[PDB]
Design a protein around this nucleic acid. Structure first.
Ligand SMILES: [Zn+2]
Ligand SMILES: [Zn+2]
Ligand SMILES: [Zn+2]
Ligand SMILES: [Zn+2]
Length: 108
DNA sequence: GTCCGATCAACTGTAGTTAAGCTGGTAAGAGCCTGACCGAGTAGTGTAGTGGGTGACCATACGCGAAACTCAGGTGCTGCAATCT
């Protein structure tokens, strides 16, 4: 919506941003080499609250997305969708007019 | 590079060693396809992290209108005085 009208000034940086706090998040993270959210359970650190929140689940068994078929736990919707698509007849015969459909790619 | 000509055997006259397949009953080469076993191949997958854009909520800005507040307009009598009598 609103136009990108805050330009990073550093040598060899191309980026422009919508609102000045975001330009500052970029500058402190990329160019100065500082981060604002530390893991309690390992050495790593993160640039956003949502990124530390994802990393915190990785230290735990009670992972926040749970499979509808097998009940395996995962941390975000992309992982869930890819995993659940393995519980489907995903693959299709690529050859002309052939009707068949398959569950594991080596079968196809 | 070439020159001479000696010299192993090239290409030339006849005297004596090699298969192919018959009768068979037979084990011998060379072989075929299903099956099993591990290495490698095809390639989509499993967590995990960087970035971005959407959405909500805010406040900041002007500009028009709404009510506020200040300061001075306006009403009407009559205490006192002056024109007409
Ligand atoms: Zn930059
Ligand atoms: Zn950690
Ligand atoms: Zn599952
Ligand atoms: Zn087919």
């Amino acid at each position: 919506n609103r136009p990108k009208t805050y330009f990073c000034d550093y040598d060899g940086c191309d980026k422009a941003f919508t609102r000045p706090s975001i330009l500052t998040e970029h500058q402190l993270s990329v160019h100065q080499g500082l981060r604002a959210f530390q893991c309690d359970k390992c050495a790593k650190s993160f640039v956003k609250k949502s990124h530390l929140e994802r990393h915190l689940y990785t230290h735990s068994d009670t992972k926040p997305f749970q499979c509808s078929y097998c009940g395996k736990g995962v941390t975000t919707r992309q992982q869930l969708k890819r995993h659940e698509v393995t519980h489907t007849k995903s693959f299709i015969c690529p050859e002309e007019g052939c009707n068949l459909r398959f569950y594991k790619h080596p079968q196809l």
